[PDB]
């Protein structure tokens, strides 16, 4: 732990003809395990991790049924939202939804979440206690009233606290060889001279999993954030992640600077010097 299961759904309307383009992806932690793409020929939920291929045809039948139903919910939503916001049929609009559950190291439920956006802006989301809704504007307040009367939060809370967690546990066990393995960052430092008086030190972390990591610089043992650049953590494409952090230093003073790396896969925090 900790661990999580999350599903992400995107529907984009197609003015002029036919249904929205719908893409659904499921993750356990930072590992995608299933996907559905309305533009794909199979029209089935497809495996994306070898451990989910253990599941039988009944699982796949069921997930395909549910995800296609999800797609129709978004299709109807796009039309409704166009009405709420008094928009024309001319433009493409998007709905996004994400939900999922987090468990701690003991694999017990920690938190659940369910959030919805229209055209990239908050629309409605379950509150932290999974018992009520946060509606961003009057259109979403109309939806909140509807979902209150239909007891949607109660259904979702039951799922998030029960089924979501139970299935996360199942996946963690079935996929133990990779899901429960941590890959510590492989680190090194590079050096470049911009001019006679200024150098850049870059501290690299490669090949790590999960994606959560902290990379920081110190100067003479004290936190250094000025004259640093930290790139967004990025996927390697083989399941692992990469990140780097750089600092600009006076040439000849490189020895004052140290990079510090924290990650789940490192029992002791790590230090690099030039």
């Amino acid at each position: 732990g900790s661990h999580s299961m999350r599903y992400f759904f995107t529907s984009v309307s197609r003015p002029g003809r036919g249904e929205p383009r719908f893409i659904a992806v499921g993750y356990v932690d930072d590992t995608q395990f299933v996907r559905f793409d309305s533009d794909a020929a199979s029209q089935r939920m497809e495996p994306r991790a070898p451990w989910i291929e253990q599941e039988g045809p009944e699982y796949w039948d069921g997930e395909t049924r549910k995800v296609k139903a999800h797609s129709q919910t978004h299709r109807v939503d796009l039309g409704t939202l166009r009405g709420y916001y008094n928009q024309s049929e001319a433009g493409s609009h998007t709905v996004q939804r994400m939900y999922g559950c987090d468990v701690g190291s003991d694999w017990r439920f920690l938190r659940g979440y369910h959030q919805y956006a229209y055209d990239g802006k908050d629309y409605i989301a379950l509150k932290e206690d999974l018992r009520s809704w946060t509606a961003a504007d009057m259109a979403a307040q109309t939806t909140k009233h509807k979902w209150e009367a239909a007891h949607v939060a109660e259904q979702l809370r039951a799922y998030l606290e029960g089924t979501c967690v139970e299935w996360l546990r199942r996946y963690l066990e079935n996929g133990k060889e990779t899901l429960q393995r941590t890959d510590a960052p492989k680190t090194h430092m590079t050096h470049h001279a911009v001019s006679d008086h200024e150098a850049t030190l870059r501290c690299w972390a490669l090949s790590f999993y999960p994606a959560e990591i902290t990379l920081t610089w110190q100067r003479d043992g004290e936190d250094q954030t000025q004259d640093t650049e930290l790139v967004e953590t990025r996927p390697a494409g083989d399941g692992t992640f990469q990140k780097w952090v750089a600092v600009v230093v006076p040439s000849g003073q490189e020895q004052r600077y140290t990079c510090h790396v924290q990650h789940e896969g490192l029992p002791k925090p790590l230090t690099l010097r030039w």
């Binding site: 499921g26 997930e63 549910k66 139903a69 109807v76 409704t80 409605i124 089924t163 979501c164």
Partner: peptide
């Protein structure tokens, strides 16, 4: 394992 949605906005 997906939740049944079905509640439209």
């Amino acid at each position: 394992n997906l939740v049944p949605m079905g509640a439209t906005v």
